């Protein structure tokens, strides 16, 4: 899932 400032799913 989305981890602010680290990982943003498509």
């Amino acid at each position, epitope marked *: 899932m989305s981890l602010p*400032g680290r*990982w943003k*799913p*498509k």
Partner: antibody
Amino acid sequence: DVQLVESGGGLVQPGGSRKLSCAASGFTFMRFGMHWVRQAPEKGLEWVAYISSGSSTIYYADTVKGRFTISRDNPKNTLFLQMTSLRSEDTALYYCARSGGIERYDGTYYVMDYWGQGTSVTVSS
Amino acid sequence: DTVLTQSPASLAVSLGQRATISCRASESVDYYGKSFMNWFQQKPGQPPKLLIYAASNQGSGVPARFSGSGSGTDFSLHIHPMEEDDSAMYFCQQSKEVPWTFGGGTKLEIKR
């Protein structure tokens, strides 16, 4: 291309306050989350604070959480770090680094891809 | 926080040889099939530069001599062949959890 220039550092008395700026150019500033990282004399890198492109998400290091405030002014292409209650242990070179997104077939991994030269903060009387 | 133990604290490698730096995480940095492990090169008086992101992906202007491997809590940065301007401080970092953490760093010097 992408240029980040910090400024505002200097000598500050313990318990003092100081605002640092980070001027961005060469990219679409409003599109990137930004960080402040510090490096104490003869020390490693220590993450200080983070701010999303639109300021919705802000994260701080525990030792900084109450005294330091991170903010940005997208129209002016500038990132700030407001420091208060400066402690000797805040003496360090402060860098602003960009949070660059890298595209994968499934998402975008973020990392501090560009760093500035930094500003030196000396907390001493 | 997930603590990163970086070894060795320093090393000296001859030109042409491989220099490997290791980094152990207190907690796995794996997240959704990826490893949130990054490595930076910091030249004296200079800002850090991204080398490897996501454990084994080379950054923008990064030579093929710079590689990275590992997953979970076990990670290494490899530099082969070692060249003249490689002498510098290197740091691992995890981007899975907040706060972002860095290894203690390792001073890589040319053994002459």
